[PDB]
Amino acid sequence: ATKLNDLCFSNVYADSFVVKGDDVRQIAPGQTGVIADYNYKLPDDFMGC
Amino acid sequence: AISSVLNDILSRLDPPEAEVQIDRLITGRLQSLQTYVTQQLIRAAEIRASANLAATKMSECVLGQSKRVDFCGKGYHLMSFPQAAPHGVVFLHVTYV
Amino acid sequence: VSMAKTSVDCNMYICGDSTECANLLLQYGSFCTQLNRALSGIAAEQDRNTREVFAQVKQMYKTPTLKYFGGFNFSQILPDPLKPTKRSFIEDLLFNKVQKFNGLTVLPPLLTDDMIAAYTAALVSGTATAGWTFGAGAALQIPFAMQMAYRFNGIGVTQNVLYENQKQIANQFNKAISQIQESLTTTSTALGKLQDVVNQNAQALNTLVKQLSSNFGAISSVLNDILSRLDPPEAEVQIDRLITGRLQSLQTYVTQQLIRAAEIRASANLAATKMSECVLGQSKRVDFCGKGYHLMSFPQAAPHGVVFLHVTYV
Amino acid sequence: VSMAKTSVDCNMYICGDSTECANLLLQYGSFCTQLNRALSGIAAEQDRN
Amino acid sequence: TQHTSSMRGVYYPDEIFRSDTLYLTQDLFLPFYSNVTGFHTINHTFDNPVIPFKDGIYFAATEKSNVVRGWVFGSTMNNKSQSVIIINNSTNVVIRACNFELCDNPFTHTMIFDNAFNCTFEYISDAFSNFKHLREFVFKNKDGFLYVYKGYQPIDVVRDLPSGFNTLKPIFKLPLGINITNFRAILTAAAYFVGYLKPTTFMLKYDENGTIT
Amino acid sequence: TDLIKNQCVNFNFNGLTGTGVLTPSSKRFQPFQQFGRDVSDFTDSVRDPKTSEILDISPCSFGGVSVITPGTNASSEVAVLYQDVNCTDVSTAIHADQLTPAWRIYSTGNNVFQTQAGCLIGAEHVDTSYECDIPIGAGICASYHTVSSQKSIVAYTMSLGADSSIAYSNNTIAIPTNFSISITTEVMP
Amino acid sequence: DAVDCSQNPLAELKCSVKSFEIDKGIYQTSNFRVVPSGDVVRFPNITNL
Numbered sequence: 001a002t003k004l005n006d007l008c009f010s011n012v013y014a015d016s017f018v019v020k021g022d023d024v025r026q027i028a029p030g031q032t033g034v035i036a037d038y039n040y041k042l043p044d045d046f047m048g049c
Numbered sequence: 050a051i052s053s054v055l056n057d058i059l060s061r062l063d064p065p066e067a068e069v070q071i072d073r074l075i076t077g078r079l080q081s082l083q084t085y086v087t088q089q090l091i092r093a094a095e096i097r098a099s100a101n102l103a104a105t106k107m108s109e110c111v112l113g114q115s116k117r118v119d120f121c122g123k124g125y126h127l128m129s130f131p132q133a134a135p136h137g138v139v140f141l142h143v144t145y146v
Numbered sequence: 147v148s149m150a151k152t153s154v155d156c157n158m159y160i161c162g163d164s165t166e167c168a169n170l171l172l173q174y175g176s177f178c179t180q181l182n183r184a185l186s187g188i189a190a191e192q193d194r195n196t197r198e199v200f201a202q203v204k205q206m207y208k209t210p211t212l213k214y215f216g217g218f219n220f221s222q223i224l225p226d227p228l229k230p231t232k233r234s235f236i237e238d239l240l241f242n243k244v245q246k247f248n249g250l251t252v253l254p255p256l257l258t259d260d261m262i263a264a265y266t267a268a269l270v271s272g273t274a275t276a277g278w279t280f281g282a283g284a285a286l287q288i289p290f291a292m293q294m295a296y297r298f299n300g301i302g303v304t305q306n307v308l309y310e311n312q313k314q315i316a317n318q319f320n321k322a323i324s325q326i327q328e329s330l331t332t333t334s335t336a337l338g339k340l341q342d343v344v345n346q347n348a349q350a351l352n353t354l355v356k357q358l359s360s361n362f363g364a365i366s367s368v369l370n371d372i373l374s375r376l377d378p379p380e381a382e383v384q385i386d387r388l389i390t391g392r393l394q395s396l397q398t399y400v401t402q403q404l405i406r407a408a409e410i411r412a413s414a415n416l417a418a419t420k421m422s423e424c425v426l427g428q429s430k431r432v433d434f435c436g437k438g439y440h441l442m443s444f445p446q447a448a449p450h451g452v453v454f455l456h457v458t459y460v
Numbered sequence: 461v462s463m464a465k466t467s468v469d470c471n472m473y474i475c476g477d478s479t480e481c482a483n484l485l486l487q488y489g490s491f492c493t494q495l496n497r498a499l500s501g502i503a504a505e506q507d508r509n
Numbered sequence: 510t511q512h513t514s515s516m517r518g519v520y521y522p523d524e525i526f527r528s529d530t531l532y533l534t535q536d537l538f539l540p541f542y543s544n545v546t547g548f549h550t551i552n553h554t555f556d557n558p559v560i561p562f563k564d565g566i567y568f569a570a571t572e573k574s575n576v577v578r579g580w581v582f583g584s585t586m587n588n589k590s591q592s593v594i595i596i597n598n599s600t601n602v603v604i605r606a607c608n609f610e611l612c613d614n615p616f617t618h619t620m621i622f623d624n625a626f627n628c629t630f631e632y633i634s635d636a637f638s639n640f641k642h643l644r645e646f647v648f649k650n651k652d653g654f655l656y657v658y659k660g661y662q663p664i665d666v667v668r669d670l671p672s673g674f675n676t677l678k679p680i681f682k683l684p685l686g687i688n689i690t691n692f693r694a695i696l697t698a699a700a701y702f703v704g705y706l707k708p709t710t711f712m713l714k715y716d717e718n719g720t721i722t
Numbered sequence: 723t724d725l726i727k728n729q730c731v732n733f734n735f736n737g738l739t740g741t742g743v744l745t746p747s748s749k750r751f752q753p754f755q756q757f758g759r760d761v762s763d764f765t766d767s768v769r770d771p772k773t774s775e776i777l778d779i780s781p782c783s784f785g786g787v788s789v790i791t792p793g794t795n796a797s798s799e800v801a802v803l804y805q806d807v808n809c810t811d812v813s814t815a816i817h818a819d820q821l822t823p824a825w826r827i828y829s830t831g832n833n834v835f836q837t838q839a840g841c842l843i844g845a846e847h848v849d850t851s852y853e854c855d856i857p858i859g860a861g862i863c864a865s866y867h868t869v870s871s872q873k874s875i876v877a878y879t880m881s882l883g884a885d886s887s888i889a890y891s892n893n894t895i896a897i898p899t900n901f902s903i904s905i906t907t908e909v910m911p
Numbered sequence: 912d913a914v915d916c917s918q919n920p921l922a923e924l925k926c927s928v929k930s931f932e933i934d935k936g937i938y939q940t941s942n943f944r945v946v947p948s949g950d951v952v953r954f955p956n957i958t959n960l
């Protein structure tokens with residue numbers, strides 16, 4: 001995160017939503033659960049933040 | 050590793066974690082060097098065998114007359130001449146048939 | 147003058163029908179390709195090693211109608227057409243004493259035993275009647291006794307000695323052959339050198355297979371027992387660890403095969419020289435074509451090797 | 461026409477005075493043993509030479 | 510009395526079929542020529558002490574009158590904790606794991622325990638109805654299970670345990686989940702023997718039939 | 723499900739999974755054995771949990787595949803060799819496409835000939851012999867020749883050399899009455 | 912230009928040697944295998960619920 005200031009990008013995208021606290025942990029690659037499987041899925045790759 | 054390019058790890062990735070990525074990449078590459086040099090030693094040994102033979106032939110086919118059959122040519126050895134060649138030696142074997 | 151033309155399926159060996167494994171193998175680049183070429187190179191050399199030794203004559207000759215030459219028997223050296231086989235008696239004796247989920251196999255040689263036997267037969271026939279130009283140019287028919295007379299001259303024995311003692315010499319020759327037959331028939335040390343090469347080959351392959359069961363610090367040596375109970379994160383970590391181990395086992399094997407191949411090449415090169423100097427002519431150098439003053443010699447076919455019978459004056 | 465008959469105890473070399481090391485070494489099976497034999501087989505020919 | 514184990518105490522270590530092969534492994538086997546302890550039931554003297562288990566033992570008995578009926582395996586050997594009683598009940602084989610109030614000297618009547626509480630395991634087999642018979646057993650603890658092997662051969666010995674070789678076959682794998690550190694023999698002349706198993710490396714020779722010879 | 727035999731299937735027994743070919747066997751299993759292994763640590767056979775039948779597991783055919791070609795500057799043609807495979811299975815799995823890799827444009831014609839080396843498809847077999855150009859194995863070589871004005875890849879038995887013969891006598895001899903001088907070459911790195 | 916490495920055996924060799932020109936001879940370009948058909952699943956008889 002520190003080094004984001006040293007990088008250039010062709011674009012920046014941002015996704016936004018509200019979830020239950022316990023479900024926040026599902027917003028990551030390699031996860032399973034109600035959110036991870038049926039609401040919001042991430043690819044097997046890095047995520048900005 | 051994240052990337053084959055060292056700079057694309059070291060530059061952007063957090064310096065702690067980066068050591069893990071770098072260490073892995075280093076190990077990977079070191080293995081190819083060990084493989085490469087091993088094969089080169091083996092190849093070199095084969096060349097020695099060839100060079101040793103060439104030296105023998107020079108002495109016995111050019112600087113003298115060999116009697117051992119088929120060493121300096123199929124026929125009955127009379128003469129030979131060496132020629133320069135790109136990383137090798139070319140012989141002209143003159144024989145009686 | 148050869149070793150088994152082995153071959154290894156890199157993917158089968160490393161990744162036992164595992165997709166995840168394969169993906170984690172591709173990440174290592176040309177690993178499998180490099181191994182494949184190395185083994186292929188060896189197999190190619192194994193072929194040359196045989197051809198360079200046996201194919202010394204451009205013409206194939208027919209077995210002589212009669213094998214009896216000036217009292218010299220020869221019957222156990224040449225093939226006997228009465229039998230369905232194409233080998234000599236001695237050769238038959240020599241040849242009597244020497245898929246899988248591991249992805250390992252062996253390829254056949256270009257020249258089969260029958261083809262090799264044919265070459266040896268031609269060389270013996272040549273030796274017996276073609277004279278001194280057999281391997282130099284057109285064959286020149288010569289009476290056997292006259293050929294021997296020449297050989298004795300080369301030893302440093304006055305020509306007449308052979309003729310005067312021809313009967314005794316032919317008898318001793320024939321006897322010596324019979325003696326060898328008995329020695330070969332009833333021994334177990336004979337082509338120990340050839341058996342040694344075979345044994346070592348087997349050990350290398352056995353070792354390689356055994357390594358598939360190696361754990362390498364992993365949860366399990368079996369990929370299926372990694373995937374079946376682990377989330378993808380750890381599963382990949384475990385697979386990668388297992389792959390690393392197996393990758394090393396292959397490079398180790400090939401390295402040893404390359405070294406081994408080099409030694410076989412050296413042997414094959416010498417065999418070619420000996421045939422040229424001891425069979426196609428009369429070598430004068432000491433202690434090269436037997437343990438006496440060289441007269442002549444005969445080649446015989448053998449399972450992955452060459453057997454020479456060296457006839458010497460003592 | 462010869463070289464020194466090198467011989468090394470592969471157990472002591474790797475896990476000298478360590479049980480825990482040996483316990484982990486065992487996970488590599490007979491590697492240690494095979495390697496030892498391979499070396500001996502070389503020393504054997506020095507006598508022949 | 511101390512005796513020699515000879516080459517006895519060998520058993521099939523796993524349910525894996527093999528054929529015509531030499532298999533090298535390591536397990537709790539009875540060491541060859543180990544020190545075997547003999548026990549006797551003669552006239553007024555009956556050996557029925559509590560013997561340490563040491564994670565696995567070897568047992569054998571020479572019979573002509575079926576004096577030996579079973580064993581009790583456990584820790585405290587009383588109704589304070591769990592123990593398992595394994596007996597030939599004369600019509601059925603009966604195995605029970607409970608907090609048993611055991612007889613201090615157990616033996617037309619079954620005198621093994623007065624009470625049983627907190628039973629966790631019960632099993633009853635199908636029904637049935639010089640020394641002559643040698644019975645052999647191996648008892649091992651693994652992952653809460655009591656592994657039991659059995660064998661048998663005809664004999665003609667008076668006091669000793671004849672030298673020989675015999676591979677035993679598995680019979681029970683009891684999911685007892687109990688602590689076995691000690692055991693006692695259950696008796697009705699006769700004799701029996703106890704040895705101890707060790708994590709020893711053995712080379713086993715499998716014949717064409719897949720049996721160990 | 724029912725057992726599917728004598729073909730490659732995906733199997734799942736209660737404790738053993740994988741792929742391969744299931745066939746009946748006579749292995750002498752004991753009353754306390756479920757499955758067995760080969761000399762090497764691979765599953766040999768399994769006893770069925772339902773019918774108590776014993777079936778062996780064979781590997782699905784696999785191997786190396788090589789191509790035989792002339793130069794691309796001469797023509798565009800190729801014969802394909804499948805190492806150590808019975809041509810009956812090769813053909814079957816082409817019609818019943820079960821092969822990996824499969825080609826987008828490919829078929830199997832009458833040019834099918836099996837050698838010890840493996841199954842060779844695309845070459846024309848002949849009953850004659852020639853100098854071995856491209857070695858295959860077991861006395862078989864490939865070459866590119868005109869076959870009654872179109873050239874093609876052919877499979878043939880290699881010749882061992884020229885066919886000749888000389889007479890033997892106890893009273894005659896051959897002696898050269900002429901000679902020539904020739905020059906040959908040799909190269910070494 | 913381009914080579915479709917799946918079109919035919921010739922393409923595979925061209926791709927393998929990274930060249931649009933091949934001189935002569937016999938080359939191993941890949942392995943091969945047969946693809947399995949259906950599934951076979953087997954279990955014990957009794958189900959104790």
Ligand SMILES: *[C@@H]1O[C@H](CO)[C@@H](O[C@@H]2O[C@H](CO)[C@@H](O[C@@H]3O[C@H](CO[C@H]4O[C@H](CO)[C@@H](O)[C@H](O)[C@@H]4O)[C@@H](O)[C@H](O[C@H]4O[C@H](CO)[C@@H](O)[C@H](O)[C@@H]4O)[C@@H]3O)[C@H](O)[C@H]2NC(C)=O)[C@H](O)[C@H]1NC(C)=O
Pocket residue numbers: 214219220221
């Ligand atoms: C070059 O040197 C070789 C080696 O010495 C000679 O070859 C031998 O030639 C003889 C000639 O026949 C072979 O003779 C053998 O005789 C055995 C005895 O049985 C016969 O003789 C007794 C004598 O009283 C009679 O009672 C009996 O009825 C027979 O007449 C046979 O048993 C041998 O048979 C062999 O071949 C058959 C073929 O199927 C086999 O089944 C037998 O087991 C056995 O192998 C044979 O007949 C002798 O065997 C030859 N030896 C070899 C090694 O071949 C050459 O003749 C000599 N060349 C010249 C020109 O002299």
Ligand SMILES: *[C@@H]1O[C@H](CO)[C@@H](O[C@@H]2O[C@H](CO)[C@@H](O[C@@H]3O[C@H](CO)[C@@H](O)[C@H](O)[C@@H]3O)[C@H](O)[C@H]2NC(C)=O)[C@H](O)[C@H]1NC(C)=O
Pocket residue numbers: 313314315317318
């Ligand atoms: C020089 O050495 C040779 C052989 O090394 C000697 O020839 C051998 O001479 C003995 C008798 O002196 C022969 O033995 C006889 O053979 C006949 C054959 O039927 C037999 O009937 C007799 O009872 C006896 O066994 C022997 O066979 C012979 N060797 C050969 C191959 O013929 C030679 O005599 C030696 N020179 C001198 C001067 O002694």
Ligand SMILES: *[C@@H]1O[C@H](CO)[C@@H](O[C@@H]2O[C@H](CO)[C@@H](O[C@@H]3O[C@H](CO)[C@@H](O)[C@H](O)[C@@H]3O)[C@H](O)[C@H]2NC(C)=O)[C@H](O)[C@H]1NC(C)=O
Pocket residue numbers: 587588589590610
């Ligand atoms: C295992 O079971 C035995 C049963 O024999 C238990 O031993 C018994 O424990 C009781 C209680 O301390 C002892 O005293 C008895 O108390 C009752 C109370 O009314 C009284 O009526 C009896 O006369 C007696 O006093 C009893 O003597 C004792 N039995 C013996 C033989 O000593 C034992 O404690 C149990 N073990 C565990 C771990 O529970």
Ligand SMILES: *[C@@H]1O[C@H](CO)[C@@H](O[C@@H]2O[C@H](CO)[C@@H](O[C@@H]3O[C@H](CO)[C@@H](O)[C@H](O)[C@@H]3O)[C@H](O)[C@H]2NC(C)=O)[C@H](O)[C@H]1NC(C)=O
Pocket residue numbers: 598599600601603619633
């Ligand atoms: C020694 O073994 C005998 C025979 O198993 C035991 O006697 C038997 O005890 C059972 C009760 O546990 C009696 O009832 C049986 O119950 C089963 C329950 O499903 C039922 O299927 C049977 O038909 C029967 O009702 C059984 O009748 C009885 N048999 C006899 C001959 O007495 C005996 O208790 C055992 N002794 C010890 C100390 O365990």
Ligand SMILES: *[C@@H]1O[C@H](CO)[C@@H](O[C@@H]2O[C@H](CO)[C@@H](O[C@@H]3O[C@H](CO)[C@@H](O)[C@H](O)[C@@H]3O)[C@H](O)[C@H]2NC(C)=O)[C@H](O)[C@H]1NC(C)=O
Pocket residue numbers: 717718750
């Ligand atoms: C272990 O493998 C051996 C193989 O030697 C099996 O023993 C053999 O079993 C056969 C069948 O009962 C025995 O009888 C034979 O029958 C044939 C029928 O034509 C007959 O020609 C033979 O002369 C013989 O009568 C054979 O004697 C027997 N061999 C021995 C040494 O006992 C054995 O049954 C296998 N064990 C198990 C558990 O299957």
Ligand SMILES: *[C@@H]1O[C@H](CO)[C@@H](O[C@@H]2O[C@H](CO)[C@@H](O[C@@H]3O[C@H](CO)[C@@H](O)[C@H](O)[C@@H]3O)[C@H](O)[C@H]2NC(C)=O)[C@H](O)[C@H]1NC(C)=O
Pocket residue numbers: 771772773774956
């Ligand atoms: C699991 O339960 C099934 C019950 O269907 C058992 O399968 C059945 O086994 C019998 C004996 O092999 C099969 O053959 C039958 O034999 C009788 C003999 O008289 C015959 O009358 C029938 O027409 C038939 O041939 C029967 O087909 C078979 N049933 C099925 C659906 O396969 C199975 O053996 C049990 N497994 C175990 C381990 O007991």
Ligand SMILES: *[C@@H]1O[C@H](CO)[C@@H](O[C@@H]2O[C@H](CO)[C@@H](O[C@@H]3O[C@H](CO)[C@@H](O)[C@H](O)[C@@H]3O)[C@H](O)[C@H]2NC(C)=O)[C@H](O)[C@H]1NC(C)=O
Pocket residue numbers: 808809810836
């Ligand atoms: C390629 O596969 C085919 C088909 O399996 C093989 O042809 C078959 O070869 C067998 C000999 O092994 C032929 O004889 C059979 O022998 C068994 C032995 O018990 C017998 O039970 C059968 O009734 C039969 O006699 C079989 O007839 C033959 N099939 C055909 C259709 O001819 C072929 O040999 C295989 N090629 C290679 C190189 O292995």
Ligand SMILES: *[C@@H]1O[C@H](CO)[C@@H](O[C@@H]2O[C@H](CO)[C@@H](O[C@@H]3O[C@H](CO)[C@@H](O)[C@H](O)[C@@H]3O)[C@H](O)[C@H]2NC(C)=O)[C@H](O)[C@H]1NC(C)=O
Pocket residue numbers: 887888889
């Ligand atoms: C030295 O003498 C030998 C023996 O005569 C010559 O070899 C033989 O030469 C004839 C004629 O060139 C070869 O052909 C034969 O022709 C007759 C004519 O009717 C025919 O019936 C035969 O079937 C055969 O075709 C004969 O094959 C040949 N034999 C061999 C073993 O080569 C030899 O050429 C003479 N050498 C010199 C330098 O004159």
Ligand SMILES: *[C@@H]1O[C@H](CO)[C@@H](O[C@@H]2O[C@H](CO)[C@@H](O[C@@H]3O[C@H](CO)[C@@H](O)[C@H](O)[C@@H]3O)[C@H](O)[C@H]2NC(C)=O)[C@H](O)[C@H]1NC(C)=O
Pocket residue numbers: 891892893
């Ligand atoms: C070279 O070896 C051949 C082997 O066939 C010799 O030819 C044969 O020579 C004999 C003697 O001149 C010929 O006559 C035979 O004499 C015996 C005497 O008992 C008689 O029993 C035979 O029936 C026959 O008459 C024989 O026909 C002849 N064979 C042939 C096929 O021509 C030849 O003489 C030897 N040459 C030299 C220089 O030794």
Ligand SMILES: *[C@@H]1O[C@H](CO)[C@@H](O[C@@H]2O[C@H](CO)[C@@H](O[C@@H]3O[C@H](CO)[C@@H](O)[C@H](O)[C@@H]3O)[C@H](O)[C@H]2NC(C)=O)[C@H](O)[C@H]1NC(C)=O
Pocket residue numbers: 899900901
């Ligand atoms: C060994 O064979 C060679 C074959 O070339 C012989 O050499 C050749 O001998 C002829 C006659 O002496 C040479 O002259 C030729 O004469 C004819 C007559 O019309 C003429 O048309 C030709 O153009 C030529 O002049 C011929 O040039 C010569 N070959 C060469 C390359 O010079 C040789 O003599 C034979 N050796 C023995 C010892 O017989």
Ligand SMILES: *[C@@H]1O[C@H](CO)[C@@H](O[C@@H]2O[C@H](CO)[C@@H](O)[C@H](O)[C@H]2NC(C)=O)[C@H](O)[C@H]1NC(C)=O
Pocket residue numbers: 608626627
């Ligand atoms: C029957 O066995 C159970 C355990 O298998 C006993 O319950 C345990 O008793 C000990 C006594 O200190 C407690 O510490 C454990 O926590 C208890 N476990 C449970 C799950 O409650 C039970 O008391 C035994 N009953 C008898 C009569 O002995």
Ligand SMILES: *[C@@H]1O[C@H](CO)[C@@H](O)[C@H](O)[C@H]1NC(C)=O
Pocket residue numbers: 510511
């Ligand atoms: C019986 O026990 C005593 C105890 O010391 C021992 O000395 C004696 O030898 C034992 N009997 C036999 C036959 O060993």
Ligand SMILES: *[C@@H]1O[C@H](CO)[C@@H](O)[C@H](O)[C@H]1NC(C)=O
Pocket residue numbers: 511544
């Ligand atoms: C085994 O028993 C004999 C009996 O006399 C004894 O002397 C020996 O020391 C015992 N061995 C061990 C290790 O106790």
Ligand SMILES: *[C@@H]1O[C@H](CO)[C@@H](O)[C@H](O)[C@H]1NC(C)=O
Pocket residue numbers: 584688689690
């Ligand atoms: C069995 O009892 C002994 C007695 O001290 C104890 O140390 C041991 O841990 C017990 N084992 C189990 C599994 O409870």
Ligand SMILES: *[C@@H]1O[C@H](CO)[C@@H](O)[C@H](O)[C@H]1NC(C)=O
Pocket residue numbers: 793795796
């Ligand atoms: C190779 O290409 C050249 C290009 O003109 C052609 O002439 C030559 O004949 C080709 N070689 C073969 C074997 O066709």
